[PDB]
Amino acid sequence: IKKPNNNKILVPKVSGLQYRVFRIHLPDPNKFGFPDTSFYNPDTQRLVWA
Amino acid sequence: YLPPVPVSKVVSTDEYVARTNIYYHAGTSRLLAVGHPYFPIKKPNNNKILVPKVSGLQYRVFRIHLPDPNKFGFPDTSFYNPDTQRLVWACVGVEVGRGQPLGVGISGHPLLNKLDDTENASAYAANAGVDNRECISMDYKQTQLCLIGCKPPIGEHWGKGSPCTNVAVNPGDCPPLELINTVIQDGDMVDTGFGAMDFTTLQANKSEVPLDICTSICKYPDYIKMVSEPYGDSLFFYLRREQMFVRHLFNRAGAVGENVPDDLYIKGSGSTANLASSNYFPTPSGSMVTSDAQIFNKPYWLQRAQGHNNGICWGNQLFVTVVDTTRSTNMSLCAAISTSETTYKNTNFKEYLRHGEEYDLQFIFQLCKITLTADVMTYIHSMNSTILEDWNFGLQPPPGGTLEDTYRFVTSQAIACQKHTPPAPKEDPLKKYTFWEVNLKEKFSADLDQFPLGRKFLLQAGLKAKPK
Amino acid sequence: KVVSTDEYVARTNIYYHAGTSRLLAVGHPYFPIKKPNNNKILVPKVSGLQYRVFRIHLPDPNKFGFPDTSFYNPDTQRLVWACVGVEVGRGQPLGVGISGHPLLNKLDDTENASAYAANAGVDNRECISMDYKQTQLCLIGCKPPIGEHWGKGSPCTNVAVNPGDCPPLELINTVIQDGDMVDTGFGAMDFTTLQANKSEVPLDICTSICKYPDYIKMVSEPYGDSLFFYLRREQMFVRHLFNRAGAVGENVPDDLYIKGSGSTANLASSNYFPTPSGSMVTSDAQIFNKPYWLQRAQGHNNGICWGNQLFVTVVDTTRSTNMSLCAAISTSETTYKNTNFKEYLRHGEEYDLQFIFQLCKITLTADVMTYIHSMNSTILEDWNFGLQPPPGGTLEDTYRFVTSQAIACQKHTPPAPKEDPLKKYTFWEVNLKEKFSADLDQFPLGRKFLLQAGLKAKPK
């Protein structure tokens, strides 16, 4: 749905048959520590989510 | 098992808190501001401005948000349990960078309330005409100051008070005043030494002062009341320098409200038959600036501060106010509407005024935990409970009871949208009050050797290494 | 940090059972019956598609002594019932009912058309009926089932709404009340507000707001005590394809097609809606008449029913059969006429409930007391722990009042027999208080409870 003269959408076109695409960001683990972090060196290594 | 005893009046913030072994820094690139010195620029019909008024002579506010202790990462966290405890930042040291070359600005007014110059008078002046108002400018007092605290800065100013009713107000009377405390806001006008007050309500002629200060309320800080705080948390530290001197001696031209009784003089005659106005006002002037007078561009360092706050910034929050008079110089340029004609024309050139503004913030911080008993909780909730709101209270009971939480329907909805147009609840208690903002929360670094500021912080105490 | 209830609770050795005789209900499916001038209902409106809401009280255990009561201190502690296992009896012969509407917005068949359709007149509505989606569900917990539906909200104020605008939509939770309607596959919303035509669907749903459970928000409860358990089965398939007929709200931008002419000069209505069609019913997919056994549920409640209260909500489509009978006003004439016979419609309803229960005690400390008081403090009222010292030094009785010398006019404190704050919310009720028995063996249901755990049949 869009204004007739304009090109701006008045209402988004949506139906179930549209695919969906979800993108999900995670915060960098290696800014984010733990109750106990001593178990590793953050320098020689890194952390990655699974 | 019912609230137990121990001591206070207030206490040293260094009583219960402990210090950690770890530090951090972050800082903005820099900021910039441009605008017109005297008055903001808006479309004639539109209230919304084309260009903001900007001057160094305006006060400047700074409010700096910080990230959660609880969500934030550490090379070694072993030392604590976030269950029984919380964590709060500590502010050890602070810098203010200023990069512009230094030079004086100036301000004036085209129609100035003016009588004469008594600094030299060769003869008795003329007599009251109509609208002799003139255009003069002046240099405001050179000034520097710095203010740092977890709580809003409080200044003070005069204000017109509600009189009593015994004699009714006649037109032209002098209204009594009440010295008024208020929260300091952004863009507010540094007093020039004419007193912290509202010219608007108090001066009706509107021609008394240069434009900049005409409308608004110049304000001035009260050390006493600020320092008088029980917690010190208004501001835990500060510095100031300023100087001023006299230049010219003038008078106000206008009808005399109250007149000098004769007993104070001898009745004149002829040119002395009439008393000239006895209201004098000095010409304020700033003096030679120096590199030395800069209180800026140099690190500051704290250990004991006058209040009980030591480096504690509650609510992840911090305030800074700054005043520079040194860089006030305002540039001016000419845009020719007609580039063709070779002869100078006054009508050929539209004139404009803009001013440069440069700041930076670079902040050390230290990290700290709070052990919890009810005693603790008692005292803070006593002090302010709100700070307990944002936390989970270290936990609300010993087993973490919950509020029947809010899990929402929000993130996008139906093109109906009471679902929020009326946005997220609660408040900033000062959200009413306007003043500048910046977010740093992403910018922290765990290693100081990166930065000019911090490496000094080492050099002061020395590294021996950078461990942990 | 909410904890698993099974932490502090302790389980006992004793079990009981009680159940209703049976439940029986009769009503007309399509609309309620009332005296024409009066507002008083002559016959209640009932059909299988109405939801059912069962509220069940239990007597306070701690009023109920035991054969040997010594094993606990009733002072330092309490007793609270627990619900181990549950049954739902249903006795009718299984068969499908149905509904329709005499006037329905419709154009014509969309499935096959030899030639283009006719011109739109005024009111082509026709008498057509359909079957509703077959469905089965079950709901158990101590807090009422939470419903949700579409509905209209208030448009943001920029454009002033003119008549004919598209009302914005709002997603709304509410408590679920009896007599409310299952989805037909048209989704939970208010037709009454959002459908002006009032003819767009068959009768039964036209009035009220069909609603549907939200597993998310419900299961999202931190204590889970809304519902701790459930089951569902349902199915549907398409049958016919129709068109609305009415003023076009919006026309498709031309670029999505090519201009017609002649017969194709004008565009037929864009709308379509399916006609849902129930499928073959089997005796297998019946979820009832079979025991259930609970041990662990998604919530932290394990069969705890606070305040002697428990909720069950169940809806079936399978018994919807509507019997139709005829009465003769004139029994004499031997020539058949459509004049002689009035027609009425009545629909049958059969329920039964049988509930196992388990017996449980609670130790108290501050932590205990605190943790509850957080959860729901009203619970403490009906117990005896909460103290609560009162006042009340002096009074003045002035007697007597009818004596017509005026002492003050008088007594104003009825306000608190009020116990259920949900008394606003009406729904079907049954009282079990009287029916408990202490021995499973004498009941059909229980002995299975034995069989499941075995144990002795007990001697003789």
Added chain:
Amino acid sequence: FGLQPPPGGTLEDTYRFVTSQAIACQKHTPPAPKEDPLKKYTFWEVNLKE
């Protein structure tokens, strides 16, 4: 590991911001340097970071 073994760091100058209030041609008059190169490809988004 801006660079291959563990020195680290990308040592031209990093951060700049030119605005605050709005007159000058905005901070966004230059393009956004940092990229998900798929930014050309639009699709629905959600942030979990918090």
